[PDB]
Ligand binder design. Structure first.
Ligand code: B12
Ligand code: B12
Ligand code: B12
Ligand code: B12
Ligand SMILES: C[C@H]1O[C@@H](n2cnc3c(N)ncnc32)[C@H](O)[C@@H]1O
Ligand SMILES: C[C@H]1O[C@@H](n2cnc3c(N)ncnc32)[C@H](O)[C@@H]1O
Ligand SMILES: C[C@H]1O[C@@H](n2cnc3c(N)ncnc32)[C@H](O)[C@@H]1O
Ligand SMILES: C[C@H]1O[C@@H](n2cnc3c(N)ncnc32)[C@H](O)[C@@H]1O
Lengths: 223, 273, 219, 221
């Protein structure tokens, strides 16, 4: 309303002033909060609209790192502090996953020997794996995202049968990795990659997988 | 079923006899039958085909390409289910999507669910249980089909007004039945807010209060998570509480204090009125 | 169709929010009608709606292409002016550029995509680039109207494995000397409404009928 | 110290992340161009995003997009780079501007048709104008370049467009137009760009606008 008065003082007409203020889009720095606030009140439309802005503004990889991830992290912290309930997190996570799934389907899927992407048994956090899949696809790697929580014998069978060149695992929790016997990941695929918040160099060496710090290097390692 | 002479076809289609003769020789179409009278006769489906082909030519297609297109054999609707299953099982996302696209085009949104998405999901479960396929295979199929359902979900409207929370009982990780419920409700103009699976009842009641949710819908694929709940556990989740799914039943729903719904079609009528 | 709307609401009543919350067969028309009245908002929504139903490639074949042809025909018939077509083309081109940017761009020796000199229809080239991108080929779309000496230089310097040309008009191809496309790149691909096998053989490029075969061709 | 204070504000992984966060703004221009010229779309995209995050939407245009374009022009003119190279850079940079354009709002109400005079194929300045208008709440309809004046005049009539804006990068297409050719395109007709000038605009019966900042104000009031 202060801005509107400012525009009126500049010689603008009230009709023009009101229309301009309403037609005003949300500042990029505010996209994170806006997207979070939109989800918490069940405004899926506004949320989808806001994510789309960030996509155009930051780009595909950019909006994940600058919007999708920060919102999820804040959702996690708010829950741990007890500031939001589980249903709220569910709402945001399910949504943000749908967006990531769209981006994934829009990326190319090259032919040739696939790279199986998933999370270790007991890991139900799947978005980190989708990030891995998406970055690989964006770089021309036929990343086949299976979904999360795949038994090692079943994972090994698929990689053999499809002749997969590699397997990539995302560990958000460290407990499922620690619950695995030594060398559990060794013969999953010709190359085995382990990364994620719950992963580290020492634990990967124990399980017989190659540790990857960031997603950028994951692509270079494969190509 | 020959009914027209090449002279007659030239008059109807506007294509010269030389051209029609040439395309037959060069591309194998059209093929008029030869009568005992010796005349070579084109069918009514040859004329309409050539009218269509000619339109494609005017749009810039080459005769070879147009004819190849008209003739091109697509996958039969009855084989779409099998084809989609086989496509997923070899890690052919491209083929799998093309097949789902075709089925969606052929059956429509609700149609493709009953004729393709649901049958394939059911079959994947049976295949795993018989040891025919592994968990990784099933994971792949479910993730794919969930993405398709999410598209349809997003393609349906999201009406304003007090939402209807859709989720699964605590301990239930099968979410497609819930997405499916949300989808049917959106198609009928009801703002179904799908939360994802496995939601604690207190948190569920809290959100329903805060958003002023008019109703809550639960999908129970397994019966064990329902059995783990005390009598009347679902009573005060929302002003109205709905329970459905293979793991749900009228008796069990009555015990938990929820309204039981057999089919998704009837779920809409309960909410819409 | 505001009157027909009130009729539909009454039918449900005999048994408003439902009515406010589009059939796929009508997406083509709706998208065109929106553009023709300058409703970019409505247009963008309908394309995205079309996108989610047909998929990336599908919405191009079932929505982008039919609309453009109708725009082209309407222009010829005198139904619409050049200004209308301009609006529609710019919009649809923007959508394809989005899809193009949204698909991956793999590393390794690029494939240069453009049109022959004098060819200013660029969307077909974007279509070719896009299909290659979707199948994991590093398609570098340059834009239209690239002089052959310049195109050849870029391909040499970047070590491009191939060059792809889209010809919508056949005249700019005819204006080229025999074998003009021979030494552009290790492989040279020619396709489009204005291209044909004979003209391609003459210019020394490999003729490609459909975009599907173009991806297969590079492997 | 101010750098070190910022670095502290931003354990093993953190040091690599915090330190590699800084990048000289002045070097963004060259880096973006070099990225394009070797066909590195990934790097080019990354560099543009970095600059877009640093300077903002309006900022990245003046400090990155426009300077690069001009340099591409200079590089070609000196024989340094080929036409194919320039083509590549422009298409990329157009995509970015097109993104920024659609990112800005499209307000309701009578549109403003934006294009170039017939024979003008440089279109970025025209997009730029559409961008600047939209950001100030004016419903700028960008048509694309090279629009016949009668057709332009017809569309403006049908949509009840309040104004027409023309971007002239070359002066020849303006010189090729008859007196008063731009007079009745729309209730208001605006001509600007490196190929435009006050006297020439005056001849064609259009209002001359020096810069894009003032173009919005003319319409906003
Ligand atoms: C959504 C969510 C859930 C959802 C999952 C939804 C789904 N289907 O994915 C549900 C509700 C199922 C859930 C459950 C639980 N979760 Co939870 N959840 C989250 C939340 C909010 C976001 C999850 C997410 O995907 N975020 C995005 C993640 C993946 O990003 P990121 O790890 O930073 O990833 C980066 C890098 O690691 C890289 N990366 C990822 N994968 C890979 C792979 C490779 C190869 C490479 C190179 C890099 C790489 O990509 C990113 C680049 O920046 C997080 C909060 C948080 N801090 O992340 C909590 C969080 C992870 N969850 C947590 C907890 C406690 C749980 C539960 C135990 C809760 C409970 N008591 O039931 C269960 C565990 C179930 C299980 N076994 O998985 C804690 C973990 C605490 C800990 N000790 O580590 C968190 C941190 C919340 C908190 N603040 O306390 N959760
Ligand atoms: C995919 C899948 C999974 C995925 C889930 C993916 C996901 N995120 O949703 C994963 C891998 C996680 C999984 C795990 C498990 N699953 Co499972 N899974 C399936 C599968 C193949 C389909 C799941 C699905 O959503 N299908 C769609 C279903 C719901 O369709 P439908 O039955 O025809 O349902 C209709 C109606 O019920 C209606 N409906 C559903 N919800 C609602 C709600 C309302 C209100 C209304 C009105 C109607 C309605 O919708 C349909 C309309 O026609 C099913 C097989 C099957 N037939 O369902 C097995 C199945 C359900 N799972 C099974 C099992 C055994 C398990 C596991 C215990 C396996 C294990 N040992 O680890 C775990 C349990 C996890 C848990 N805690 O919940 C068994 C169930 C055994 C039983 N009869 O008790 C099945 C039947 C497989 C089998 N044949 O053995 N599973
Ligand atoms: C938009 C448009 C323009 C815009 C272009 C904007 C832009 N930046 O692209 C502008 C305004 C520049 C324009 C100008 C002209 N155009 Co015009 N234009 C059109 C329009 C409406 C659509 C063009 C389009 O994008 N089509 C979509 C493309 C993708 O279709 P397609 O080429 O058939 O592509 C398919 C296949 O060929 C394949 N393909 C394409 N490239 C490749 C490459 C490979 C390797 C492979 C395998 C396959 C492949 O991809 C598609 C798959 O379905 C068409 C109408 C129409 N019917 O196409 C007229 C049309 C093409 N134009 C036409 C004309 C006459 C002109 C002008 C001469 C008008 C004039 N007098 O100035 C000028 C010529 C400019 C020049 N010198 O090149 C005529 C051409 C007729 C002819 N051949 O003589 C058409 C058909 C209009 C009409 N008469 O109805 N045009
Ligand atoms: C990219 C490009 C092209 C591309 C255009 C792609 C496209 N789709 O738009 C193509 C390949 C088509 C091209 C062709 C040609 N071009 Co050229 N091109 C350029 C380049 C590198 C950038 C053009 C651009 O978009 N600039 C960005 C604009 C925004 O910058 P600006 O003009 O300074 O604009 C500012 C102000 O004027 C204001 N402004 C602009 N519009 C408006 C409107 C209003 C109302 C207002 C208030 C303000 C305003 O906005 C900006 C604010 O800073 C320039 C280099 C340069 N120095 O500009 C050469 C340049 C413009 N081109 C040039 C030439 C020679 C040509 C060709 C003749 C080459 C040829 N032989 O074919 C043709 C002409 C085609 C035609 N009929 O128009 C010369 C012009 C020389 C001259 N004689 O004046 C330049 C200057 C290059 C050079 N240094 O030699 N070109
Ligand atoms: C990591 C995420 O796990 C979710 N979370 C915590 N407890 C439960 C539960 N009982 N059921 C389901 N999800 C739960 C929270 O929403 C948190 O954000
Ligand atoms: C019902 C579905 O449960 C999946 N399933 C079976 N065992 C496991 C497991 N250990 N972890 C995750 N999913 C499993 C199978 O893929 C089956 O299809
Ligand atoms: C192929 C498209 O080219 C456009 N078109 C036709 N004539 C001209 C011209 N003189 N200048 C610019 N564009 C033109 C029309 O809008 C047609 O649909
Ligand atoms: C102003 C811009 O025009 C481009 N340019 C110069 N000559 C041609 C041509 N024959 N065809 C296409 N573009 C050309 C150059 O790439 C220059 O940068």
């Amino acid at each position: 309303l202060k801005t509107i008065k400012r525009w009126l003082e500049e010689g603008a007409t009230p009709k023009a002033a009101i229309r301009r203020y309403l037609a005003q889009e949300v500042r990029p720095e505010d996209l994170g909060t806006g997207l979070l606030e939109a989800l918490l009140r069940g405004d899926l439309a506004g949320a989808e609209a806001l994510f789309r802005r960030g996509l155009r503004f930051w780009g595909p990889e950019g909006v994940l790192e600058h919007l999708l991830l920060p919102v999820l992290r804040e959702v996690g912290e708010a829950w741990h502090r007890g500031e939001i309930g589980v249903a709220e997190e569910h709402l945001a996570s399910t949504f943000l996953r749908a967006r990531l799934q769209e981006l994934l389907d829009l990326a190319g899927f090259p032919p040739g020997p696939p790279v199986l992407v998933t999370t270790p048994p007991g890991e139900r956090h799947e978005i980190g794996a989708m990030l891995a899949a998406y970055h690989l696809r964006r770089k021309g790697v036929p990343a086949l995202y299976l979904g999360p929580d795949t038994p090692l014998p079943d994972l090994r069978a698929l990689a053999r049968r499809l002749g997969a060149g590699a397997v990539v695992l995302s560990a958000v929790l460290s407990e499922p990795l620690r619950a695995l016997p030594d060398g559990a990941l060794k013969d999953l695929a010709p190359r085995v990659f382990l990364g994620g918040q719950g992963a580290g160099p020492e634990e990967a060496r124990r399980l017989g997988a190659e540790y990857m710090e960031d997603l950028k290097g994951l692509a270079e390692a494969l190509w």
